[PDB]
Paper text:
Here, we used X-ray crystallography and cryo-EM methods to describe different oligomeric structures of a [name] from [name] ([name]), and provided a cryo-EM structure of OsCyc1D367A mutant in complex with the substrate GGPP. The structure of monomer [name] consists of an αβγ domain and a catalytic center located between the β and γ domains. [name] catalyzes GGPP to form syn-CPP, in which new bonds form between C6 and C11, as well as between C10 and C15.
To determine the structure of [name], we used the stable N-terminal truncation variant of [name], OsCyc169–767, from which the plastid targeting peptide was removed. Residues located within or near α22 interact with residues in α25, such as Q627 with R720, which are at a hydrogen bonding distance in the crystal structure. The interactions between α23 and α24 include R652 with Q675, as well as E640 with K686, possibly through van der Waals interactions. The interaction between dimer C/D and dimer E/F is identical to the interaction between dimer A/B and dimer C/D, suggesting that a pseudo-twofold symmetry axis exists between the chains C and D. In addition to the abovementioned interactions in the center of the hexamer, a linkage exists in the γ domain of protomer B and protomer E, which protrude to the edge of the crystal hexamer structure. In the crystal structure of [name], the distance between the d1-oxygen in D367 and the d2-nitrogen in the conserved N414 is 2.97 Å.
Author numbering:
A (entry chain B): 81 to 116, 121 to 184, 195 to 452, 457 to 694, 696 to 767
B (entry chain A): 79 to 767
Write the structure that this text describes.
């Protein structure tokens, strides 16, 4: 409990960003001379963050580009100000011996050229040096200088290595805070070249905000929120921070642009990674968002990361787009349709290859996203897996320096999640152990599977994988119980021929569900209808699965005790229409599992193609958080259907390997 | 006036009772033969003879003046003689018409094989014996009789001492002539009013031979309430009610008497037995004609009834009219069960299913035939009644069509009934019923044309013909006609036109929507299109939402396989309910579910319906279509259940609205366009009177 409050106070205090200080950008800001050093606290930061091998940068992850480039950039500060020559050469040793990332081949050449303007014994004569110094010109050539001055671009992030540019038409391109694409390095060098006080103002605040020392990117108010939400959400503890999450999710909605989302509010250049993350979470949490904001990253069928700079697209952004395409609504622009296909192909061509590199388990995160589309993504399934995939402090981010995200790439995030999940597994085992008794002492295993522990186990598991909450135990057990009766009864009819020869008064049977003073009567009425559905759908070809599901949501709605006001006309329609979809969607599923007869891949792929279709209009009506039906009622429909889909799209082998991994393979 | 005629039928319906039936000369003169109880020499009921004298027909016959039947005139005519002569009074008129028997007796040989009177072959030979005794000049040696005489004896072979005297049979109706019977075991058999199978005649013979004063009360009861004179069967409290309802219902004017009908329909529910129904409350032998009528009308009017009472009349594969006795089945009783078999619910005992199958076949063997005469009724247009129910099953039976047709089929005062004598039922087979129904129907047609011109104007004024059907002129006509054939009432104009308008708009938009391929290529908004349908401001809020919801359904069901015909049906019923401004006030959980299910079934039925009408002209296969026809028919039963079960908490009017919309979709899919406008012509344009 203390931990939840820990994450809460961290989220309530959300802001510009929790980022690690970058050694390179801090010393490059140290290089700015008094307006009459200008930030002696940049230097005061520098002296202390020296690693024992005499080097700099990220300590916990050793990277060549990072330890070298961060180390020397601190050196070019200490010696060019002729102070602390003790550590200055002590780290000059590190550079010499280990001489054998973003903007690396642009900021490093201007940093050696800057190393020449001082004296510093460093192997410039490196065979590795010529290969990346050649790419200096291999890129400064494909960049059109007259285009770098016309529209804000990703290049403006590396102006320390840029030579002889028109600042008259460049200051027109900065971010809203005055920064040059949010690099303090690019703004320091832009200030050495022009004294724009709004371009200074970005810099001083960044050092004031950190009491010395400055990161490699700022601010990142959007990226951080979006990703902190997705992370808490996947970890299953999102329910604890509902006001805080909906607090900053609002912020993302406020700053939605028709051109997409950037990593910060005040960056005019947008990227697909942030837009897809934003689009998914905004739609997932019930906001009105239009996916057409994506066609800004489509150029002739292909999907890049920036609007124009057709760079090679990385792996993580395509994952995040693929996920956003999974919340496809039928009324949406086709761009989301095209996006799904492209991103699936991108990640499939790469799945069978270790070319999944960009974080702890990025292939596992991706296998899931591809093997379990939305219709079959049960939140506890994803969450159990995600505990074994979330990197914690292990995740590192590739910027100008190696940097880390304090707020959402946290170790407290895991300790909290694995706690809340263990208590779920504990509450789950006691839950079913109580269920097993209930099943047996009812002469109820005589009906059902030829191994009723298996028909019980999956029937309880589905309900708990979806309605997993602490207190919602009333509903969960109700779902499991009613499910078992329905399975039992369907089994009895299947090997007897129908209610035609129902010798018994099997209406009763609900009295196997314990009497609640508010629950029992209405549950009798719903169960009566499921029976009445059998005798009518009996001597025909329509399946009953549609009505089995419809009964379920009816009970789950009786437990948990919310009713649908029926005087209001649109309240009636939205409910009555949700039932139609669930009745229709589960009936089509039961037709696919019959064609798996077992022949015609062409025919099965037709049924799948249209179930996905009807699922979209359901997913729309369930998430559309303005609809006149209670969000919990809407979730109840989504829960039942997803579980039905889950079952219909999964081998019994895969299904209980999940059961073992979520309920029994204890975390912590 | 129209109001008076409705009041005429009404005040008569309030005064319903034991029967309004016509007097029988035969049953009456047989009661004059009963000598005074107080040991006096005047006949016990002198008012029977008072009646005799007054109604001798001009040819000296007796019986039905308006309908001449030989069998009818002989038995009623001589029975009056064997009365008048047996008291040796009025021998002057006794003779005039004694010759009628003399001259026309030979003609007994011509009668229509099919409709011979009841107990004719038992009660007429019994009447030679009473004439022989009074010694009358009669052709007892008529060769025409030998055929009925000796086929009495073989008729009178199914008499056993053991069965006639242990459990009641219909022979008890005609024991006027019967020898060597043991009344001690026979009185244990009669009906509750004391009659012998409700025959005043048979009860008189049972009185000459048994002084049973608790059975006399029955005869005195008839003679007081009919002021002398006596019907050929009494009482008819169940039959008369059942038939008055079916007639007023098919004549389309049931609604004016909703209270009156629901009164005596209650009278039937109270007296429903697991053995079936008879024509009276107090007759232990039940018959399929009354039992079938009661079941249908009861289930039609929202009563809980179980068809399993029908297997009381199933005798291994066949459907007779009585429980014990297996007899040649007549036409009207099979028609009336067949009509009842149309209301099968999916929960029913199977016998109602099988009966449908039998009488369909029974009536088919007979449709292509001279045989269509009934043994029970002689009605103006009896095959037309059978035509419709045979061609138009429940799902496609629109109430205004049936009623239009029935107006030219109801015989009115012309219908005559076959008992021991020809008798008539004045109450529900009269001319005021027809005069009234045609009135209520003409005022329906007049208002129909007036509305039509409003539709024609409205369709124009909205420019919606730009993309109607091919000829929007008939897509208008039919879409009004479907709505008017169903919601036809006086007041309901609000809903009807709204139905027609919303149907036209919806179809119009769907037409254009197909033209271009979906909203993907739609430059237009269309959301505000309903403002083309007139509407009060204290209503526009919900009609917009229903339409917006329908469009959302379009965008979903596009580039998919499911049709929208379901959702257009939902849209209509949703719209009609808005125009009638009733919503489901606030119900418990099963109220919501029950509504949600009607929407489900309606949408599901109409998709399945529009799945055959494209697989019609496409990949034929009679068996592939019977798969769809089966699948639609099933859903209809569960829906027909959910509409008609009058215990439900959803308003009657909401449920009926679902049936109207679905029935109209059915009518269209199952009707040749050639026939469909013949109906349109006949109900809206081919005016009655």
């Amino acid at each position: 409990t203390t931990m939840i409050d820990g994450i809460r106070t961290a989220l309530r205090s959300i802001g510009e960003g929790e980022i690690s200080i970058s050694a390179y950008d801090t010393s490059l800001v140290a290089l700015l001379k008094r307006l009459d050093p200008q930030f002696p606290s940049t230097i005061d930061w520098i002296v202390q963050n020296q690693l024992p091998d005499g080097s700099w940068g990220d300590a916990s992850f050793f990277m060549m580009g990072d330890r070298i480039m961060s180390t020397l950039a601190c050196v070019v500060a200490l010696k060019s100000w002729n102070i602390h020559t003790d550590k200055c050469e002590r780290g000059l040793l590190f550079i010499q011996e280990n001489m054998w990332l973003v903007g690396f081949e642009i900021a490093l050449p201007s940093l050696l050229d800057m190393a020449k303007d001082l004296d510093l014994d460093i192997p410039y004569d490196e065979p590795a040096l010529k290969a990346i110094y050649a790419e200096r010109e291999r890129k400064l050539a494909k960049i059109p200088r007259d285009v770098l001055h016309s529209m804000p671009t990703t290049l403006l992030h590396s102006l320390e290595g840029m030579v002889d540019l028109d600042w008259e038409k460049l200051l027109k391109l900065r971010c809203l805070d005055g920064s040059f694409h949010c690099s303090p390095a690019s703004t320091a060098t832009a200030f050495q070249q022009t004294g724009d006080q709004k371009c200074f103002e970005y810099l001083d605040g960044i050092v004031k905000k950190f009491n010395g020392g400055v990161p490699c990117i700022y601010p990142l108010d959007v990226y951080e929120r979006l990703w902190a939400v997705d992370r808490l959400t996947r970890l299953g503890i999102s329910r604890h921070f509902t006001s805080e999450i909906e607090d900053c999710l609002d912020y993302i909605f406020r700053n939605w642009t028709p051109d997409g989302l950037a990593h910060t509010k005040n960056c005019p250049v947008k990227d697909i990674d942030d837009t897809a993350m934003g689009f998914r979470l905004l739609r997932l949490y019930g906001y009105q968002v239009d996916p057409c904001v994506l066609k800004k990253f489509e150029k002739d069928g292909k999907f890049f990361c920036l609007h124009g700079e057709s760079n090679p697209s990385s792996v993580t952004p395509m994952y995040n787009t693929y996920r956003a395409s999974q919340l496809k609504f039928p009324g949406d622009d086709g761009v989301l349709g095209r996006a799904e296909v492209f991103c699936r192909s991108f990640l499939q061509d790469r799945r069978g290859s270790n070319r999944m590199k960009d974080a702890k388990d990025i292939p596992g995160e991706v296998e899931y996203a591809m093997d379990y589309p939305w219709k079959a993504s049960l939140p506890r399934i994803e969450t159990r897996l995600y505990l074994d995939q979330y990197g914690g402090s292990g995740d590192v981010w590739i910027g100008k320096v190696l940097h880390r995200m304090t707020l959402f790439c946290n170790d407290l995030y895991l300790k909290a999640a694995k706690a809340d999940f263990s208590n779920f597994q504990k509450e789950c085992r006691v839950e079913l152990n109580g269920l097993r008794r209930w099943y047996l002492r009812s002469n109820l295993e005589k009906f059902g599977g030829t191994d009723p522990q298996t028909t019980l186990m999956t029937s309880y598991f589905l309900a708990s994988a979806n309605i997993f909450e602490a207190n919602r135990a009333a509903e969960r057990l109700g779902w499991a119980r009613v499910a078992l009766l329905a399975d039992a009864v369907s089994s009895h009819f299947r090997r007897i021929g129908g209610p035609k020869n129902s010798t018994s008064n099997l209406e009763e049977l609900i009295s196997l569900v314990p009497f609640d003073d508010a629950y029992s009567g209405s549950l009798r009425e719903a169960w009566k209808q499921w029976l009445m559905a059998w005798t009518a759908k009996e001597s025909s070809q329509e399946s009953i699965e549609g009505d089995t599901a419809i009964l379920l949501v009816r009970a789950i709605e009786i437990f948990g005790g919310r009713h649908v006001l029926t005087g209001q006309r649109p309240d009636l329609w939205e409910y009555s229409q949700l039932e139609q979809l669930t009745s229709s969607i589960c009936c089509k599923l039961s037709r696919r599992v019959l064609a798996q007869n077992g022949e015609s891949t062409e025919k099965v792929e037709e049924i799948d193609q249209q179930v996905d279709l009807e699922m979209q209009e359901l997913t729309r009506r369930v998430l559309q958080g303005c609809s006149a039906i209670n969000r919990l009622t809407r979730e109840t429909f989504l829960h039942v259907v997803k579980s039905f889909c889950y079952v219909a799209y999964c081998s019994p082998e895969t299904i209980d390997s999940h059961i073992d991994k979520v309920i029994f393979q204890d975390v912590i």
